[PDB]
Point group: none
Chain length 225, copies 8
Amino acid sequence: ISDNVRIKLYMEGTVNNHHFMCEAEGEGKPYEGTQMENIKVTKGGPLPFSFDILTPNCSVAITKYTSGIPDYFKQSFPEGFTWERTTIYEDGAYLTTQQETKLDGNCLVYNIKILGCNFPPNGPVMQKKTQGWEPCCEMRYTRDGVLCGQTLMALKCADGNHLTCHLRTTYRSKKAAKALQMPPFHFSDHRPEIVKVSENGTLFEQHESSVARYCQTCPSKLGHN
Amino acid sequence: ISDNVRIKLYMEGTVNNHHFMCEAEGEGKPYEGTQMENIKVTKGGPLPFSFDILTPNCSVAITKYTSGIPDYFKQSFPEGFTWERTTIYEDGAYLTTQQETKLDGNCLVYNIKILGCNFPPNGPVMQKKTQGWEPCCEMRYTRDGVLCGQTLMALKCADGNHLTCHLRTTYRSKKAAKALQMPPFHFSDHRPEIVKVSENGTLFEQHESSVARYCQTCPSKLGHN
Amino acid sequence: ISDNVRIKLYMEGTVNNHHFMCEAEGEGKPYEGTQMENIKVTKGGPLPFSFDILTPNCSVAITKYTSGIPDYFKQSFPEGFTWERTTIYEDGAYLTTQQETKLDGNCLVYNIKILGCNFPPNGPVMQKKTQGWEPCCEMRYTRDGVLCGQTLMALKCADGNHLTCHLRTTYRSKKAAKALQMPPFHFSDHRPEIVKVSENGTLFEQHESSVARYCQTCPSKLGHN
Amino acid sequence: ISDNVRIKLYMEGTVNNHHFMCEAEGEGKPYEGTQMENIKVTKGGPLPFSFDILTPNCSVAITKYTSGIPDYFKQSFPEGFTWERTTIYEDGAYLTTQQETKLDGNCLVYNIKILGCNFPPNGPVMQKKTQGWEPCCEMRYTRDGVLCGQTLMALKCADGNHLTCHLRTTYRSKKAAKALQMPPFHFSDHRPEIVKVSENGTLFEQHESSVARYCQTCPSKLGHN
Amino acid sequence: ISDNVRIKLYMEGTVNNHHFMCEAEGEGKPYEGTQMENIKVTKGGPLPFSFDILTPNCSVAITKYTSGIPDYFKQSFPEGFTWERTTIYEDGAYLTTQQETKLDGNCLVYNIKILGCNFPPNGPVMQKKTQGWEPCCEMRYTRDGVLCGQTLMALKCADGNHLTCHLRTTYRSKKAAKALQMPPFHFSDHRPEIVKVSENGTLFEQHESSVARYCQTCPSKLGHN
Amino acid sequence: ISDNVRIKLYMEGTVNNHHFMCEAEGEGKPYEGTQMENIKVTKGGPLPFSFDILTPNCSVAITKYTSGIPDYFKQSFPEGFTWERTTIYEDGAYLTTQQETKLDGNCLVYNIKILGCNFPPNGPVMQKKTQGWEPCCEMRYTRDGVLCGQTLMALKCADGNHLTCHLRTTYRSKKAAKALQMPPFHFSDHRPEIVKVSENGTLFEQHESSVARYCQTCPSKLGHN
Amino acid sequence: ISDNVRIKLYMEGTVNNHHFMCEAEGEGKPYEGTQMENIKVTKGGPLPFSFDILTPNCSVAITKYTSGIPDYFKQSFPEGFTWERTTIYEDGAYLTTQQETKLDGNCLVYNIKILGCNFPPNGPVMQKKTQGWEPCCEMRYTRDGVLCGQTLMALKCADGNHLTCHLRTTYRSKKAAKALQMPPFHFSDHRPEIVKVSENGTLFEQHESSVARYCQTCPSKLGHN
Amino acid sequence: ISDNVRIKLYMEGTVNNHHFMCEAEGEGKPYEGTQMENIKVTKGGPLPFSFDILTPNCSVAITKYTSGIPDYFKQSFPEGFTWERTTIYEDGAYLTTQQETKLDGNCLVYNIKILGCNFPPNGPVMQKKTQGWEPCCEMRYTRDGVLCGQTLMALKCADGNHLTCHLRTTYRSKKAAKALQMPPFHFSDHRPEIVKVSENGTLFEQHESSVARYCQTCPSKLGHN
């Protein structure tokens, strides 16, 4: 994959019985870990819920992998990969995702399927009273030949409070595991941001910065990474 | 709704990145709480996983509502209703469902969407070692003007062990609240069974019996139901 | 055990940094499945939270075991048994319990240790908005030589809502597995009730009826329990 | 609190019906974020389970707080503070903790109470097949006047796997909120390590390094921390 | 006024900065002192506080006036009347009401305006911990050519406690003073009750029964009524 | 307590800087709720103010307790009880009372201390332009293990007016919580009357009838008391 | 907010069954703590009661906050704030207010709702015998995340007397608590004055000066402000 | 009165049925407005409630009267004066006081009588959780030949909150109003402080500073004080 790539995204889902579709065009810098997308709600807009719950579903090939840690995602191309996940919100809501990532020439294509349920109608998400995500840190480890990840995230609320959730993910390379160099346990910092909302809340300018690393703030007395 | 109806079912989903589709035809006696369906895997079958995880997705209009407990599901016709649910398995797997129920005269139609993830490859489900569900008891209560339900279920394994999961559901009537009498807290027993498997593991004959009731085994010292 | 026993209970715990102690005297009919206790908050009372969260920690030997289902608990005497559990509330609260049960003559003795945390200060429990529990249905099955249980319960709120929770329990007989007839999968209905409160909310007259059984409301089409 | 303090620790608990007690003696550098402890199992040892599950219970006052982020723990002295927590393991085990921290002169004193349950007998913890914790990242945010924290952790297993768990903590200062400089959302890296084991597996030399910080690796288009 | 009248009600208010509006249709028997209303929260519902604080603002023409005591309210028709009041809660909350009562054909029409303030957020009202009002007794006496009333009321709380308040009212007939027979000092017993709640806590079936009288339980030694 | 008792009263107080003392001999029928007293102003009389403000301070053990409502006062004997109260008049006057009640054989002994302030000099009380109390209804309810009471009273005024006041009382039994049966919410009707004044307005023959009950005039469409 | 702003006011209310509306245009120097307004009675004028009771309801953003005391009102912009209050008069009258404050450019807009009752017809207010307010001192302190205030005020009467009242206020910022610097206990002096009355008592030129401060006249022996 | 006087104090009271007596010795500078006292609980100590509620009953001749405001208290000597007051706390407690002040040579003598009631057992006063008073501002005005006063005060609580109360006072000179120059409306700042506690919490070194003035922070447009 090159240093610069364009992004094409297609999304479809149903949350609390509300069907919607999204489409996006953007660009990314795979080795710099930076991405930008202009995401449009093509159907079912304006959504009866905060767009924030959709953001984290829109990036794992665009991450700056440091310290010589093998890159499970960039190694997967041209074949590409898929990933599956369930996000559990502290107030009882569940959002499950299935995504396919492929590289068509120099354009990264994301195909997303979503099913969400039990979001409280008076909660901050359904009342559209959230104000974006705080940055987060994902824990990544191998299991059964695939790469897994778990993340704790926190949504900023109008009240000043934070609505927390838990993501449990399984990343699946379309390439036979044997043809890959599996990584050791590591982390990935992520900072999702929505810097612009327009067209009556149906078009969002979203950005992302992410870096894969080891724990670099706390030295190891046993000589481990 | 008629005391004698036919059933038509359409199901599509992806579990652990495996896409599939199913269809079925059946019969049911809404007031008797009994139903039978012949479910065929029309695409992606034989499935690489146990069909058991799909069974509970296939009937809450077909339930014997006793003790004068208002029947939220039958009261919803002709408009119909939808329900959403996430099933959490003890071994980390998640399965989310979105379902729409409509009545075309004497035929109930079920449109089901599913997304499953994180099922362990060597687990009983992906290994096809499960042997059907044990009967279960669902807890039902009102919240936010709709009907909620929670169920604990157990899959029988060759081991002699049981694989447990937790179902958290929200039932949404398409009828106006003004025309619906909401029920008090109550239970519903369910006994889902696959009485026959044919067509090289692609045709499943499922039966269902369910009864909504109060707790009748333990007397109340306060005179409550 | 006799058909009429005396009961003595000792309880100590800390919930949200609040230390407390309880003691009770009561009686029960082991084979009838009925029990009653006069529980007194001997220290830390009146409690800064609803006594309802403590009730369910107060009696698995006092249950009417029907249908010839082996009684794991009554079988445990004279040796006795212990049990451990964690109750997970839907609003983030956790309550863990360790209990020891002994039979001295015809007096059952209960020793209970509790640690509870994260109960939201404005939640139904800390605000004392509850009105007792709804009856419940426990799911019981063996695993690794011991008896497991899982129950979903619901607390009634003045508001008309219900606060739900999930109990995950492991029962441990002091008899060896070889000296016991392990039971198959079965259920246990439970109906806890507080019929009187006095002494400025420090003395509670608690009652309970329980029955172990198979699912008989829904007929098996394969001859299973 | 000074740059160099003494550490005394007392712990008691019961896990899977096994009672035990521990005591420790060590030192720490509150502003350097480094702690050294010699923990001895005084009763019930060698423990029938891996000491690893006990480690994380042994020191939030010994963390290097950076970036002007107000330090909730050091601001609580001399009055001190307590914290409560429940750890949920992926294989169904739960461990609940209650701890009090006081500063007696120039010596921090830890009093810990623990109740754990449902650890599978053949799992890596009860089988003593775990080999220490991976470094972790805690998410910290305020709520209801106290400080909350959530962490995902991974225990290294001898078979190459990682046993994951989720920590949910509430930190309670003994000072009135109006006397504290409440912190914004932030992170805390933690690196626990056992550098030596002796005395027939009853004496463990444990060390920890921790840093409180904002996300430092990801640029922000909005200029946010 | 007829022996059977219809009731139409319009209400608008703001309590602790939360705006709302209600409408109701009902029936009443003026001389029997009984009436019923189905009150709907048309705007701002579900309310973030107990509906109980609204109930008392919804009857003074529908009261059984006994012992020949002149009826200030029924004598006011067809002109009608208005009444003003401030309710002072023991925990610092205040709720002021302005009401207009008109007789349109067979329909008594109530136009209510309300402003509430200083209700503690953790009090029983804002926390919805109440379970309806206890019956009450209103003291009635003339002053400055109009009829005054004062009432002490008590809201039942989930924990067995009562939250008390003080009502101070001025009833103002629209009829010419020369056309009214003013009453002597007397009392009025009132029993407000909510017998049903539906439509996600926005529709309430409310009932009331009242009787105006002298003190009949305690005989006068001086022959007074 | 006997069905017929003698009474001895001692009262001392200061109202608007005027000191005074009273003493009385009387009798009563505790279960009949009737009592009489010949109260003599022994010091500071004739009083510079209406004797009416003193009357309500002179008898809760003498009240006919009906409907099986537990009698907190008669239950208190032989130990006895005390009560404290503050009466708030609408024109800014305050009168606080502390009273002790003891049963010496067949003689009830009342010890009363009073402090009154801010009575307007041109008001009906200081001007002696009052014509006795109207009967009243006291609201009684438990709180913190004791019995509380609130009453609204109306003093007949010169030009056909009524001077209103609010009594807030706490009754304290000398018995411990374990030896008392606390009553539910209830009312107490009271009818104080001065039937004779003599010896230059220094000797008053005072009478009273009282009855404890539930609201019996208004039907309950729920079954409550 | 600018150092010089325009003011626009809208007021509506009902006092003693008399409806009225007012509108005003004016200016203010927010940091100097001074403002002027020409208030017009647009409906219901001339008022059958002294305009003095309306004055205090007409601007807490216009106050000179000294000594470094955080300014809760100015910090609230651009979001703005609202406030609620009930004024209790010594002669039994009550007046409740609900106000919304917003800033549009450099124009502060006030929207006020009022309900008043029980004002005696022969009292100084209804007789229009008041001659403006004496200056006052408000007590300000935080509670439950918001700012509270209590003030004692006194109306000068033509006869040399003063009519006193008690104001109880809750100020509510529209910003999240965490985004505000909450103040310590403090005071605010206020000097309201009507300098001109014209157009037959329907147009009033109103002025005010206010300063927030600590107790500056009495030195602290303990070093407190 | 001289500029340096000795102070002697005698106090007796009953609060929530607890009897007590206190005696104090100290000094005061009448014109400087400062006094200090060593107050001893001579009977019934240590008190079961915070000593803070007694502090305000212990000084109005010791105040710096500025601005030419006639000093009602100093003008009263040698005859002296008395004052009476009721303190209304927000949580329902009431404390009434009667005091006599005389000048014996160069020694001011205070005789205080107190009756307090209804203090909540779990409130900060009975729980000894208050930490002194915040300074305050009393409103003073003449009425019916005497001097009245009203003050709002705030007790600092351990948790950081404030417990407020309202004082209503009447000051009565022993001289006839004829020989006195009555003051215009004015204020008096007061700063009570406890600087030392000893002898098992029965001895308190109390201090106070007070100044009588007009509003000096807000200039009058019209020309009033």
